Amino acid sequence: DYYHATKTTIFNALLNTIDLSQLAQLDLKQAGEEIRDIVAELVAIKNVSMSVAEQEHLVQDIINDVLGYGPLEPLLARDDIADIMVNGAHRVFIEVGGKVQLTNVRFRDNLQLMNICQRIVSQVGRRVDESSPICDARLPDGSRVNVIAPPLALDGPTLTIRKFKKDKLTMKNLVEFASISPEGARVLGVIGACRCNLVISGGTGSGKTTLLNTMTAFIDPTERVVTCEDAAELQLQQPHVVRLETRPPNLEGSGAVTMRDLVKNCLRMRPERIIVGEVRGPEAFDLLQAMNTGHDGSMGTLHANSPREAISRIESMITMGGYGLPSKTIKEMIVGSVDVIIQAARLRDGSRRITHITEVVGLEGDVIVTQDLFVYEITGEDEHGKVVGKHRSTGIARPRFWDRARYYGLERELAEALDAAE
Amino acid sequence: DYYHATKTTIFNALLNTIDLSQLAQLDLKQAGEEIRDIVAELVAIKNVSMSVAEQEHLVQDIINDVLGYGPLEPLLARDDIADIMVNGAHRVFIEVGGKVQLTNVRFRDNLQLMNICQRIVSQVGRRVDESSPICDARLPDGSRVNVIAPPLALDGPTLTIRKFKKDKLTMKNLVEFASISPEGARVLGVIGACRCNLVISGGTGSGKTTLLNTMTAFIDPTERVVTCEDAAELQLQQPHVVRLETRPPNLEGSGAVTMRDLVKNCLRMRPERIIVGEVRGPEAFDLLQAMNTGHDGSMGTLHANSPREAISRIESMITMGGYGLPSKTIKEMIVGSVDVIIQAARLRDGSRRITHITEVVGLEGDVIVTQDLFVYEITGEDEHGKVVGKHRSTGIARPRFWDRARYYGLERELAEALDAAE
Ligand SMILES: Nc1ncnc2c1ncn2[C@@H]1O[C@H](COP(=O)(O)OP(=O)(O)OP(=O)(O)O)[C@@H](O)[C@H]1O
Ligand SMILES: Nc1ncnc2c1ncn2[C@@H]1O[C@H](COP(=O)(O)OP(=O)(O)O)[C@@H](O)[C@H]1O
Ligand SMILES: [Mg+2]
Ligand SMILES: [Mg+2]
């Protein structure tokens, strides 16, 4: 239609109206006003016949293309849409009500899609191109953006925006979802309250962050909890929480304060309990020190499918930090610091369940010896395709952290809960 | 209400009339006098009337806000306040008697809090800002300051001021609280006077630093004492003490002076006693050398929950130094260097107790063997919930360090205190 030709002509004319870095750094309102003025002047020059609403829509589209996120803007604004999927400039899918459906939306060119994706990832200081075709990030809004570049994605740039959900689950919801039996809920409450050094492992999308947010509710209000996280996602209810946020390197690459520096500083900030948002670098090492030297009860999320895998990953993480420790020293440090590893995994049917509560008991040569206080035993599938399982206690009577439970008077609750279900 | 509104109006008028550039480097007394005159003129013009004391207090508060530290200045002045913790401009906490308590000291806005933090850090010739958000400094007063800027501190800049307490506890206080029986006090006096290579290990918040500072009171004044400590907590009263502190590397990663380097240099100062504030890394190794190769009489704290746990920790930290020393060599070094390990722990009721005063009598069967001279035996909680315990002397008539006590002519005090405790 004539609208497309008019938009193309307006874009071509405006291309020389300002530098690429001029509007990107200027005020958004000023840039929008300038774009509106330029669009009106171009329309008047071309004598394009359109209504005032049509002119406003054209101006909005021009602004979105110049500095926005292009034809994604209608989809991003919508609330019913949970996921946006762009498999090339000509394929856009959206998830509504749990159903994925195709949309008439289509980007102008694969180059436009690549430009928009680069804009989105740079929004958080990350860059995607032929030298880094894969880029996964979490936007400030909380949505997660995953981008694959042309050289990997044959059909064009592949973009996945999982929009943020502001709702937060609670231990009541987890027990009602059967993610943890009531006895498991009480034992986890004891673990959180007794200042045990948690490590909330889990798999991609398995619910580690939500589990950690629900577990932190067991922290005594008087304690000073300090939160280090790559993106604001935890919501503690404690009156005395301190929220820190790792600053990614700028476009030039300066000003990079990694989470390791944040933890190293928290060591000198008088925190009662350090809560690392997600251990994804060498900070693990420092965190373990904070776990082992004061700051009892520090938690931390980790990406690993099994507690043994989590321990192996932590050891490899400490090794990768460049510190010249031997493997046995790292294993000894892990044994000393970590108290209990909670494993959250997503079952084959898509449901999420806490599979293991594995207390690290000690070391034997090159193998860390641990005992599973709680284990999820699967038994089959329901007629609707859902998995069926039960949380069973391994019958341990005096877990290593029992002393801590005794120290805080939570001995009775643990004693009754851990043996109520077996 | 009325006072707050009047102060706000007066401050606005002064800011509109006072040029901040002149007060940036002008004399404090002259600037204060000018501010007081301007405030009086504004009050006369603004129909502000109050008591002479109220007007003087308002003028002083305005002057402090303009140039001083602001609303937290009275807290800094107060001795009773041990630690100040301001996370966000609207939440302030103080440590009183070891208890964290919120206060109604609310800053006007996060901008004022950032300005006050910048003023605080300026004293040490350092700057904290968006470019350099993390700052750690030791003010001339001895109070440590840690500041985090907005881009990292999500809920506003954070400021932790750990003031240097002067009223350090003495052995008289410790015996007053029954933390150590008077016989235990005499044994500790003998241990500290006779230059024993002792390690004061303890649990979180147990009182290791206070115990070490009480132990240091027993050293002959003529002895040259060199203290290496990150936080500068110890306060000795001898006339020939040398105080050193480490340096954390700048965010660029250069300038670090680890405790290891400090101790390695202290080896070349002919010190009579090396007193490491807290052993936390490979520096332990060097200390052990300084403990056995001259400088006999060293001391050093360490975070561990039991004498055997402390020894294992020392082995681990020596191992993590990158040296090729096997387990046997390290254990032999520890046995030959250390004499007395003092374990202080906090009990269920929050009361500190010197749980153990043990020796390291030797190495047998490839494991280090200890010998408890003083132990704490608990007899269950009382009807009030307080733990009931007694200090029991094992009755060992000939401790390994006995000869040392004899060399200084204190053997009679040792034999009396150790036996009378039975
Ligand atoms: N037990 C649960 N029951 C139902 N929904 C859950 C459960 N745990 C998590 N969820 C939901 O699953 C989605 C992903 O969970 P969450 O955000 O906690 O992921 P995560 O484990 O932190 O992921 P990542 O590995 O990417 O950091 C969110 O909608 C969360 O609300
Ligand atoms: N034996 C004791 N009795 C009573 N209070 C103590 C004792 N030892 C330490 N404290 C208190 O504990 C507080 C902190 O102790 P601290 O020196 O930090 O021990 P550590 O350095 O081992 O954590 C001090 O303010 C002090 O008042
Ligand atoms: Mg997460
Ligand atoms: Mg200390």
Q: Three-class SS string for chain A?
A: CHHHHHHHHHHHHHHCCCCHHHHHHCCHHHHHHHHHHHHHHHHHHHCCCCCHHHHHHHHHHHHHHHCCCCCHHHHHHCCCEEEEEEECCCCEEEEECCEEEECCCCCCCHHHHHHHHHHHHHCCCCCCECCECEEEEECCCCCEEEEECCCCCCCCCEEEEECCCCCCCCHHHHHHCCCCCHHHHHHHHHHHHCCCCEEEEECCCCCHHHHHHHHHHHCCCCCCEEEEECCCCCCCCCCCEEEEECECCCCCCCCCECHHHHHHHHCCCCCCEEEECCCCCCHHHHHHHHHHCCCCCCEEECCECCHHHHHHHHHHHHHHCCCCCCHHHHHHHHHHHCCEEEEEEECCCCCEEEEEEEEEEEEECCEEEEEEEEEEEEEEECCCCCEEEEEEECCCCCCCCHHHHHHCCCHHHHHHHHHHCC
Widest distance between CA atoms in chain B = 88
How many angstroms does the Cα of residue A226 sit away from the middle of ligand 2?
Answer: 23
Query: Looking at the complex, does the CB of residue A73 fall below 8 Å from at least one CB of chain B?
Result: no
Phi, psi of B17 (to 5 degrees): -105, -25
Residue B39, both tokens? 């405030």
What the block records as the tokens of B116 is: 């006050």
Q: Which among A357, A355, A362, A344 is positioned nearest to A400, based on CA atoms?
A: A362
| Cα B105 to Cα B381: distance, rounded to the nearest angstrom | 39
Cβ contacts of B265 within 8 Å, gap of 6 or more: none
Name chain A contacts of B151, Cβ cutoff 8 Å: 245, 247
Q: What is the rounded distance in angstroms from the CA atom of residue A63 to the CA atom of residue A18?
A: 13
Method: cryo-EM
Q: Are strands B352-364 and B340-346 parallel, antiparallel or unpaired?
A: antiparallel
Final resolution, Å: 3.2
Q: What angle do CA B101, B103, B104 make, to 5 degrees?
A: 160
Question: Which amino acid belongs to residue B305?
Answer: N
Nearest atom within ligand 1 for CA of residue A210: 18
Q: What distance in Å separates residue A269's CA from the closest CA in chain B?
A: 6
- Hey, is the C-beta of A253 within 8 angstroms of any chain B C-beta? no
CA B146 distance to own-chain centroid: 14
Q: Say if the Cβ atoms of B319 and A329 lie within 8 Å.
A: yes
Ligand with the closest atom to the CA of B96: 2
Residue A255 C-alpha, separation from nearest chain B C-alpha, in angstroms: 7
Torsion, Cα of B411, B417, B418, B420 (10° steps): 130
- Asked if residues A347 and A353 have their Cβ atoms less than 8 Å apart, the reply is yes
- Across B361-370, b (16+ Cβ under 10 Å) vs e yields eebeeeebeb
Residue A397 and residue A416: Cα distance in Å, rounded?
A: 10
Is there an atom of ligand 1 within 6 Å of A174 CB?
yes
* Sheet strands side by side (includes B99-103): B99-103, B92-96, B83-87, B158-162, B144-148, B134-138
Contact B82, B95 (CB under 8 A): yes
Between the CA of residue A199 and those of A196, A262, A265, A345, what are the distances in Å?
A: 10, 18, 21, 14
Per CB-CB distance under 8 Å, the chain B contacts of A323 are: 320
Half-sphere exposure (CA, 13 Å, Cβ side) for A245? Answer: 17
CA atoms within 13 A on the CB side of A258: 12
How far is CA A412 from its chain centroid?
36
In sequence order, what are the beta bridge partners of A244? A228, B153
**Do B82 and B165 meet the contact criterion of CB atoms below 8 Å apart?**
yes
Q: How many CB atoms are located within 10 Å of the residue B208 CB? A: 25
Instruction: State the Cα–Cα distance between residues A19 and B169, nearest whole angstrom.
Output: 68
List the beta strands (DSSP E) in B203-288.
Answer: 225-228, 241-244, 273-276
DSSP letter string, B10-57: HHHHHHHHS-HHHHHHS-HHHHHHHHHHHHHHHHHHTT----HHHHHH
CA nearest ligand 2 atom 10, residue? B207
A179 C-beta closer than 6 A to ligand 1: yes
CB B135 within 8 A of CB B126: yes
Contacts of A175 (CB under 8 A, 6+ apart): A181, A182, A184, A185
d(CA B4, nearest CA chain A) in Å: 26
CA B207 to ligand 2 center in whole angstroms: 4
Residue A231 C-alpha, separation from nearest chain B C-alpha, in angstroms: 10
CA distance A286 to A120: 32
User: Taking the alpha carbons of B266, B271, B272, B277 in that order, is the dihedral positive or negative?
Assistant: negative
Q: Is B149 on the interface with A (CB under 8 A)?
A: no
Report residue B286 as tokens. Answer: 């060097």
> Contact, A372 vs A186, CB < 8 A?
no
Task: Give the neighbor-by-neighbor strand order of the sheet with B367-381.
Answer: B241-244, B225-228, B273-276, B299-303, B198-202, B340-346, B352-364, B367-381, B387-393
CB-CB neighbours of B350 under 10 Å: 11
Tell the residue nearest (CA) to atom 11 of ligand 1.
A207
Query: Are A270 and B83 inside 8 Å of each other by CB?
Result: yes
Binding residues of B for ATP: 138, 165, 179, 205, 207-210, 268
- Put simply, the answer to whether A262 touches B152 (Cβ < 8 Å) is yes
Cα angle A173, A177, A183 (rounded to 5 degrees) comes to 80
Interchain CB contact of A409 with B (< 8 Å)? yes
Q: Is A329 on the interface with B (CB under 8 A)?
A: yes
For residue B5 the two structure tokens come to 């509104």
Q: For tokens 């500190």, what's the residue?
A: B352
Residues lining ligand 2, Cβ inside 6 A:
B 98, 174, 177, 179, 202, 205-210, 352
Q: Check CB contact of B25 with chain A, cutoff 8 Å.
A: no
Dihedral of alpha carbons A290, A293, A295, A298, sign? positive
Answer for the pair B161, B76: CB distance below 8 angstroms, yes or no: yes
Listed residue (B207, B196, B189, B338) closest to B273, CA to CA: B196
Report which residue type is found at A411. E
Contacting residues of B for A234, CB less than 8 Å apart = none
Instruction: Report how far residue B2's alpha carbon sits from residue B12's, in angstroms, rounded to the nearest whole number.
Output: 15
- Search chain B and give the residue with CA nearest A295: B204
Do residues A288 and A337 touch, judged by C-beta distance below 8 A? yes
